[PDB]
């Protein structure tokens, strides 16, 4: 300490031992003159808080930590964002799926079914755990319109659906059917329901996480899940309620065996055989939980909690112009490679709420009335509308009063410092409303 | 340490090493005599806690940290506010918008439409994420009354509305219409719906943030968003439900093509052509998400989360009379420029709650009864009342037991210290109920 | 300090005193090349953050903390999971129970009842405190189908049920009956209802904890709770409401004495004697609270709060390649035995919510309509459906910004470090989405 | 430091400066062999984490902090319980009350009323702030059955009731009656309603706290509150609604004066005189708030918030075999007197929720139907069922990642350490699911 303290500035007098320099964006004189073209995730600040000098002029002056000692500073910071649930940036507004796009009676008498992969995109916005799903199913439909139907494709065969129920609760071990004649609409984890000849890929989307279907060994570029994969676990068919009820008057067999085939407005349930009790529709959930664990999807995939945020990602601070470049970091000027002084999780959590609207809706569509762009197939038990789970989650932004350690810094702090927040991939982050830094230099050793 | 400790006061005896001085407002003797004309964000305190002296008299005595050493103190503080959501101070009670103000059949046979920018103000208060919106729409209407109508202006042409739905979900790729004949009233982010010849400016309001429409490169003074800007993304028209239904009895074309034109009480939906399926009404949301991303508003603007607080802003502490002035700060007496010793976020967070009242209201206006100053156009599908989003947020004030570092201080602490909290712009902050400071001096080095 | 600081790297220059090395998974170059076959709970990272070298090549270079001093580093870490409530791993998807599996009129005229232990498994997923229970009861039934019934077993005798009410509130001290003729369906802690000749074992399941029935002295391998154990505390029988009401017209005794025997669709309530007011059904809750405290189950067991998480378990960090092996730990290469540097609770908490759906359901099954795979015996007052408790809990995953102490480390940190999170049993943990480590070395003493 | 660091173990090599020893229960080898008969609140752990030695054998070896220095360690700990709201241990399942137990027409023509104190106990479980109350009222009734009634006691005179409303809101200053003819059933703090000749004592129960009736000077063993105490503040009588309404047809006085006397099924409201407007029933709340503050109960008692937990109690850690015994503590082997190294609040908080079920119930008993063991006197306005308060609280268990200071420890840490958590009264605590300790020794001074 002794002669090694002195923290000096132009003529303003000697200050001794730790003090405080401030890194702030909202500083009025600065904005107008320096970071006009920049944004909160990468700006310039005048660290000289002296009322009498131009910002430019200040950019000349310097804070001089005494030369005789290696100094260090404590970096506390206040980060506050407002990034939405889904958006193009975090890759939560896109997802490739393969659907039916054409159905025509080929040239002889046999038929043709051609499928294709299409990328559907969501309208940017902050959503629910559910409404997001819905938005996806809708985006599937919206396509069936611009193309599908108008090419021999019947809703009775739309290839992909994201629902949320255990399509085999009512199932009866012997009858081979969902006895109650209705797939019990309770919510049990996001799922994926496919059809023959199609599937979905998330290779470039974090939405996967929203669903909660994670790859059992992630570091494998690529995420395709198709029909052939979902093996063992095709949605069993609903038993014919009426045929059964209507019977019992007059070897003497009963109406049981009759597995419903279609529903009001005659929508095909595409059953494998005119025999088998299983429909062609295949569910991930079903597969994972019910089909061979050592071979099924239960093998290469993992069932887990949703998380609307789509994945806690972190950000990296960098104060290139004011702090020594940590161990192996190379010093540069390429914004997308500055040295990093602190890492921290991007300020987003998921609040959970109890859903009353769970059942309230089961007592309104039972009393017929209009429909949403979401339940375009009310009377279908499958292309219906996935049941709203009790307890929805919602991505919520929150101020993060974080605190990075104490770092080594240069002894000639420039009048104008540059602040820069970066993300995992290394790029500014548009969704930053406020960055604030406080540094407290203090002597560490001697030269 | 050795001889350098001694913390002395008048005759009261030697105290050794760190101790504690207290900065408090609620001290009874003080109020009456010193900070009568002041407020919690800028007051005087007698730091001498000795029962026997006048406050004035005390203002003479002094706490003497030993001279032989440079001292420092730990500053912990308790800040507690109660600022409301919207108010004149934080600029959340004003916002300029351009509306229709006159409609008369000009002199020949052509017509005249004159528009003007008017500033509408809200009644101060703490609101919801939604009710705030509503308050704004109302403030638009309230003006249409004092002026608009009584000058040939028909509600059928009120220029600005802040709603919250995706005005194009039911849309059908081929019919060019919102098939279900009703814009599906689900909430998906605050939006702005304009008309020809008008728009809104937030150049001087944080309400922008409440809506969640942020400028893609903020440091640009000025925020005007007009009709011409919202290009591509005019609300499509609702299909005529009846015309279509009523048909199908008797080349042989159907009632489809007929896009509704007006609604019960015949309110014009102002459609571009007697042809086109698009109404003149333009939505921001629509633009951002559906119209050309490289040219549309999606370009210069950014879609993001609401935040009722309107923007986490920070405050600055200053204890001019008791702590050495940090690095570059100049020493002065101009309250609005004192040195700063600590920065901290203004004590306001946003709590979120689940909205049951989301639908409950869809089952009460379907069963006709009175109206609120909010739904003055129930039968309009557009000037209706934006759907209440599930999950509302509410600005909430909370005590902040913060802790600034350890700062260097003078060795002659005056009997009367001055505390001062300031905001980003540098001015006291009326909404401060309690400020409390605790300082713990302790030796740092030697002189 | 003096000459002992120097933190050196290849030619990049001398860095002095503490700095920062980063342990991160999401690093792009790494994934592709090193931890392809690994997962977030056990991966490799290149700690050399220098843009110009291959990952392989980097794996050569080294960070050299000065040789002359023993160094130490501060290890802060960010752990984030997403493990579900029930699953095969945490042993929350299995549980052995003993049920009736056969009922036939033995060879002479006496009868035969054979029982057996069967393991039932749940569909993996994240559940409620209740719906979990339900899932279990269902899993009991689902078995009764594949076997039970089709072998002379009548629902009127299914052996195990997990309910949640105090089966003896209405009870009248003299009549020896539940007067109101209905077991008051309010929820009061998970319970277990058995029948003669059967029981349940949790010897290999944490579900026990979900129920909240803990063994009074845990370190005893084995958890079997059978009929004979639940002594004193057999569910009293419901009084015959009608017999009583229908009477009172004409020594002159009343219809009281008549304890109902069966319910609509005549389901036997299996009463011990045609006399006794007690049914053969026995409840844990009842036992614990009402039967002899010094002998009953109240003795060897303990009644306590549920907790959906099934048990706060912890995890162990290990950074074998970068930090000295703590006191007694042996140095090795067997992943399942690495040295441990930090322990921390596995990131899972239980959020609680208020249940409105508590009663809403009592006003819908009173108005007859379909049934769930859950209430297959609506008209039974016992095999009914346990009442939903107000205030349900739900396992929720949360990011854990933890902080382990400051640890001693090697002075030759390898270009490639290995991170490894382990659980109590010592094995990687599939449910880890993100692990992040920040180390801040700093001199501790001298060599 | 210099030669004073060395932390040694058998042959495993020299470790220098702070390191980490771990105190864990869930360690597999340990359980089976050492703490078989123990529980989580008092167990043994092998601190030697070396894979190759028996636990017994390990119990021999020792960690040797260097001899030349006095060492200290940082003790961080993870405590997690699951204790329920009410239970026998925390004394929340018992409470003495004095009730009517006999009513017979004495030998001459005068009568006899004998009262007695009885202890009622609750069924153990975790409850609500309310349902607990209810459980108590029920427990009062349940007794009236086994004894009361069957001895001339009419419900019309059951002595104690725990309700929750201000029995005198409708009251009219002149008529001396609760005009609306109904005690306005809104909830305003737990209360106690007594009758002549009886009362309640909490001398041995924390339930008092649940009610929120605390003794104004606690350190006084004993808590009896009887009739004679509740002076001034007898529940006023409800005005006869009908008598009044039915009148007004024909000095000419009105039906006012008539204070109802009994209710449907003629239950006596026991009014002092055939005159006075006051019933014999006395309320604590009433007393405290309305009767003489300098003499009434308002004097020796204190009205305050409920708190379901019944009282934040703390626990004491003790690591007898590994840390020096703090200042005045005597060293011993009596588990219930070990030295204490850290104190901490027993991990229980009270979550609050908003009650919709507040009114929902006022619109179901107004539409007659069955009754609960709770509202056995629906038509009574007094023995009714206390109104459910909006905002109920619920005891909730939570993991407590606490941190005790840095303590002095022995330099010869035994292979097997003993952990022990104790409560205020000094006894193990059955409700402990997990205890975890991490110690970080580090040199403090020299010998």
From Swiss-Prot, chains A, B, C, D:
Single Gene Ontology MF annotation: structural molecule activity
Lineage of the organism: Viruses, Varidnaviria, Bamfordvirae, Preplasmiviricota, Tectiliviricetes
Annotated family: Belongs to the adenoviridae penton family.
Task performed by this protein: Major capsid protein that self-associates to form penton base pentamers, each in the shape of a pentagon, situated at the 12 vertices of the pseudo T=25 capsid. Involved in virus secondary attachment to host cell after initial attachment by the fiber protein. Binds host integrin heterodimer ITGAV-ITGB5 (alphaV-beta5) thereby triggering clathrin-mediated endocytosis of virions. Mediates initial virus attachment to CXADR-negative cells. Binding to integrins ITGAV-ITGB5 also seems to induce macropinocytosis uptake of the virus.
Entry keyword annotation includes Phosphoprotein: yes
Source organism of the structure: Human adenovirus C serotype 2 (HAdV-2)
Compartments it resides in: Virion; Host nucleus
Name the record gives this protein: Penton protein
GO biological process: clathrin-dependent endocytosis of virus by host cell; virion attachment to host cell
Miscellaneous information on this protein: All late proteins expressed from the major late promoter are produced by alternative splicing and alternative polyadenylation of the same gene giving rise to non-overlapping ORFs. A leader sequence is present in the N-terminus of all these mRNAs and is recognized by the viral shutoff protein to provide expression although conventional translation via ribosome scanning from the cap has been shut off in the host cell.
Gene induction: Expressed in the late phase of the viral replicative cycle.
Comment text on domains: The cell attachment RGD motif is exposed at the virion surface and is involved in binding to the integrin heterodimer ITGAV-ITGB5.
Subunit structure and binding partners: Interacts with the fiber protein (via N-terminal tail region). Interacts with the capsid vertex protein; this interaction binds the penton base to neighboring peripentonal hexons. Interacts (via the cell attachment site RGD) with host heterodimer ITGAV-ITGB5; this interaction promotes virus internalization. Interacts with host WWP1 and WWP2.
Sites of Phosphoserine modification: 333
Record keywords, A-Z: Capsid protein, Clathrin-mediated endocytosis of virus by host, Host nucleus, Host-virus interaction, Late protein, Phosphoprotein, T=25 icosahedral capsid protein, Viral attachment to host cell, Viral penetration into host cytoplasm, Virion, Virus endocytosis by host, Virus entry into host cell
GO CC annotation terms, alphabetical: host cell nucleus; T=25 icosahedral viral capsid
């Amino acid at each position: 300490t002794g002669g090694r303290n002195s923290i000096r500035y132009s003529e303003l007098a000697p200050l001794f031992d730790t003090t405080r320099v401030y890194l702030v964006d909202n500083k009025s004189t600065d904005v107008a003159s320096l970071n006009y073209q920049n944004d909160h995730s990468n700006f310039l600040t005048t660290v000289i808080q002296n009322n009498d000098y131009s910002p430019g002029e200040a950019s000349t002056q310097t804070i001089n930590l005494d030369d005789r000692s290696h100094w260090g500073g404590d970096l506390k910071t206040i980060l506050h964002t407002n990034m939405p649930n889904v958006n193009e940036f975090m890759f939560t507004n896109k997802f490739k799926a393969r659907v039916m796009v054409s159905r025509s009676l080929t040239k002889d008498k046999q038929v043709e079914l051609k499928y294709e992969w299409v990328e559907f995109t969501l309208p940017e916005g902050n959503y629910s755990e559910t409404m997001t799903i819905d938005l996806m199913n809708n985006a599937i439909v919206e396509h069936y319109l611009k193309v599908g139907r108008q090419n021999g494709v019947l809703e009775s065969d739309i290839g992909v659906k994201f629902d949320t129920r255990n399509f085999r609760l009512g199932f009866d071990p012997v009858t081979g059917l969902v006895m109650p004649g209705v797939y019990t609409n309770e919510a049990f984890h996001p799922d994926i329901i496919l059809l023959p000849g199609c599937g979905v890929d998330f290779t470039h989307s974090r939405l996967s996480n929203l669903l909660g279907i994670r790859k059992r060994q992630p570091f494998q570029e690529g995420f395709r899940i198709t029909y052939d994969d979902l093996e063992g676990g095709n949605i069993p068919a609903l038993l014919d309620v009426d045929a059964y009820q209507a019977s019992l008057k007059d070897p003497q067999k009963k109406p049981v065996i009759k597995p419903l085939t279609e529903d009001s407005k005659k929508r095909s349930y595409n059953l494998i055989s005119n025999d088998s009790t299983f429909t062609q529709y295949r569910s991930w959930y079903l597969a994972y939980n019910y089909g061979d664990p050592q071979t099924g999807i239960r093998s290469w995939t993992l069932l887990c909690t949703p998380d609307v945020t789509c994945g806690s990602e972190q950000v990296y601070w960098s104060l290139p112009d004011m702090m020594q470049d940590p161990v192996t970091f190379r010093s540069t000027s390429q914004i997308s490679n500055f040295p990093v002084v602190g890492a921290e999780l991007l300020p987003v959590h998921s609040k959970s709420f109890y859903n009353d609207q769970a059942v309230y809706s089961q007592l309104i569509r039972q009393f017929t009335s209009l429909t949403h762009v979401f339940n375009r197939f009310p009377e279908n038990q499958i292309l219906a509308r996935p049941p709203a789970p009790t307890i929805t989650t919602v991505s919520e932004n929150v101020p993060a009063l974080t605190d990075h350690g104490t770092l080594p810094l240069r002894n000639s702090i420039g009048g104008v410092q540059r602040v820069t927040i970066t993300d995992a991939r290394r790029r500014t982050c548009p969704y930053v409303y406020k960055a604030l830094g406080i540094v407290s230099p203090r002597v560490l050793s001697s030269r």
